[PDB]
Scaffold this active site. Structure first.
Site, short mmCIF file in Angstrom:
data_model
loop_
_atom_site.label_atom_id
_atom_site.label_comp_id
_atom_site.label_asym_id
_atom_site.label_seq_id
_atom_site.Cartn_x
_atom_site.Cartn_y
_atom_site.Cartn_z
N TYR A 54 64.23 32.49 161.41
CA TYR A 54 63.13 32.04 160.51
C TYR A 54 61.82 32.76 160.82
O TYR A 54 60.83 32.52 160.11
CB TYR A 54 62.95 30.53 160.58
CG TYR A 54 64.09 29.82 159.92
CD1 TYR A 54 64.06 29.51 158.56
CD2 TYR A 54 65.23 29.51 160.64
CE1 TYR A 54 65.14 28.90 157.95
CE2 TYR A 54 66.30 28.86 160.05
CZ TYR A 54 66.26 28.56 158.70
OH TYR A 54 67.32 27.91 158.16
N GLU A 92 71.29 21.18 164.03
CA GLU A 92 69.86 21.14 163.69
C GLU A 92 69.41 19.70 163.73
O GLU A 92 70.25 18.77 163.49
CB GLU A 92 69.51 21.85 162.38
CG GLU A 92 70.20 21.34 161.13
CD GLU A 92 70.10 22.32 159.98
OE1 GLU A 92 69.40 22.04 158.98
OE2 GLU A 92 70.70 23.41 160.10
N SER A 141 66.64 29.58 165.22
CA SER A 141 65.18 29.44 164.96
C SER A 141 64.53 30.81 164.75
O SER A 141 63.74 30.93 163.81
CB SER A 141 64.49 28.65 166.03
OG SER A 141 64.85 27.28 165.96
O1 LIG Z 1 67.83 23.71 157.81
C1 LIG Z 1 66.93 24.31 158.63
C2 LIG Z 1 65.75 24.86 158.10
C3 LIG Z 1 64.81 25.45 158.94
C4 LIG Z 1 65.07 25.48 160.31
C5 LIG Z 1 66.25 24.94 160.83
C6 LIG Z 1 67.18 24.33 159.99
S1 LIG Z 1 66.40 25.05 162.57
C7 LIG Z 1 64.90 25.91 162.56
N1 LIG Z 1 64.14 26.45 163.49
N2 LIG Z 1 63.04 27.00 162.83
C8 LIG Z 1 63.16 26.74 161.56
N3 LIG Z 1 64.30 26.03 161.34
#
Ligand SMILES: Oc1ccc2c(c1)sc1nncn12
Length: 347
Positions: free
Chosen positions: A241, A326, A238
């Site tokens: 990002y 995820e 996370s």
């Molecule tokens: O495929 C994704 C895209 C964005 C995303 C994840 C998986 S896990 C996560 N945590 N913050 C953003 N994200």
């Protein structure tokens, strides 16, 4: 008046000059297309242009047809490459960066409307900005049980493949977005406290409007499991990002209660995964590595998947296997934002 730690958080996330600088870092031309003149019409037209680019990428059609589609995008969403030939958007990765840029512009569009003063208001502008979020942020005691569990979740679920930084927890806020409790699917089983990361420009949008599914015009292949809200059980998956860096090394991480219910478990990307649910409440992209249930604890009756992560023995026999889980829910009524971490990235 506002707690000093809340004032610093608001001042940080409501900084329009920082939004200007993040946009210039992503090559968006704020001189030609100022944030004050940014509209949802401009963004939607941008998404429409990226769809044509997606088609060229899909077909392996680079050359002149791709260059024409990219110029239409750069005309609708002005970029500053100085004296360089504007680059083609050629790879899925490159297309994703442009989707992220439009997602950032969408949250900045929200921010510019919100970070406005009223003459008649007897409040300091900082106070007006906070009120306009319709989201309570309460500082938590660093000696509290919650801070300890959240510190451990942050450190124990830092992935081994994200070794370019560590994270130091500077501060912790409780989040209560107005209306989010009332809407939430309290009934659904499998409620987990999960991570979400975002760029610093996006938090005014996320806190005032909640986590949202992608724009309907966004290219479907930008989304590994379709247009839902994405979460990790690994803090660093996370925190990548956040797009923090050596120079901008303060970012935020969000913990939310996610009502997963029954997961449709998938081994490989499927942008149409939403259609495959069929009675299930969420998609789970299975990783090679994950926290084990033997280390799970609860916070406010949500499961916290404390690390360390270990091999799940899951392999995609005919494709790339995700390194890490995820979780995707397709309805914001399955999300309740709960904690906001102010994180120092140690590069
Ligand atoms: O495929 C994704 C895209 C964005 C995303 C994840 C998986 S896990 C996560 N945590 N913050 C953003 N994200």
């Amino acid at each position: 008046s506002m707690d000093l730690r809340v004032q610093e958080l608001i001042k940080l996330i409501c900084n329009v000059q920082a939004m200007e600088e993040m946009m210039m870092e992503m090559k968006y031309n704020t001189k030609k297309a100022p944030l004050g003149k940014l509209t949802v019409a401009q963004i939607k037209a941008g998404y429409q242009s990226l769809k044509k680019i997606e088609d060229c990428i899909r077909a392996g059609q680079h050359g002149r047809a791709l260059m024409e589609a990219c110029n239409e995008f750069y005309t609708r969403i002005p970029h500053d490459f100085g004296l360089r030939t504007p680059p083609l958007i050629r790879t899925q990765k490159e297309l994703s960066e442009k989707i992220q840029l439009l997602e950032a512009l969408g949250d900045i569009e929200i921010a510019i409307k919100l970070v406005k003063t009223e003459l008649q208001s007897p409040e300091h502008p900082l106070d007006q900005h906070y009120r306009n979020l319709h989201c309570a942020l309460r500082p938590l005691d660093h000696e509290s049980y919650e801070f300890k569990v959240i510190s451990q979740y942050l450190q124990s679920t830092h992935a081994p493949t994200h070794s370019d930084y560590t994270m130091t927890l500077l501060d912790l806020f409780e989040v209560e977005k107005d209306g989010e409790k009332e809407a939430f699917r309290e009934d659904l089983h499998n409620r987990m406290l999960l991570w979400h990361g975002s760029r610093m420009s996006n938090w005014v949008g996320i806190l005032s409007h909640g986590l949202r599914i992608a724009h309907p015009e966004a290219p479907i292949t930008g989304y590994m499991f379709g247009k839902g809200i994405y979460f990790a059980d690994m803090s660093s998956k996370s925190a990548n990002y956040c797009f923090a860096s050596r120079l901008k090394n303060t970012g935020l991480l969000l913990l939310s209660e996610v009502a997963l219910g029954q997961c449709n478990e998938l081994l490989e990307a499927n942008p149409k995964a939403e259609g495959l649910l069929q009675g299930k409440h969420s998609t789970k992209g299975l990783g090679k590595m994950a926290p084990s249930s033997a280390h799970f604890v609860t916070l406010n009756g949500s499961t916290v998947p404390l690390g360390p992560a270990s091999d799940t023995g899951i392999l995609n026999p005919d494709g790339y296997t995700l390194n890490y889980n995820e979780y995707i829910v397709y309805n914001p009524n399955q999300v309740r934002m709960r904690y906001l971490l102010k994180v120092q990235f140690n590069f």
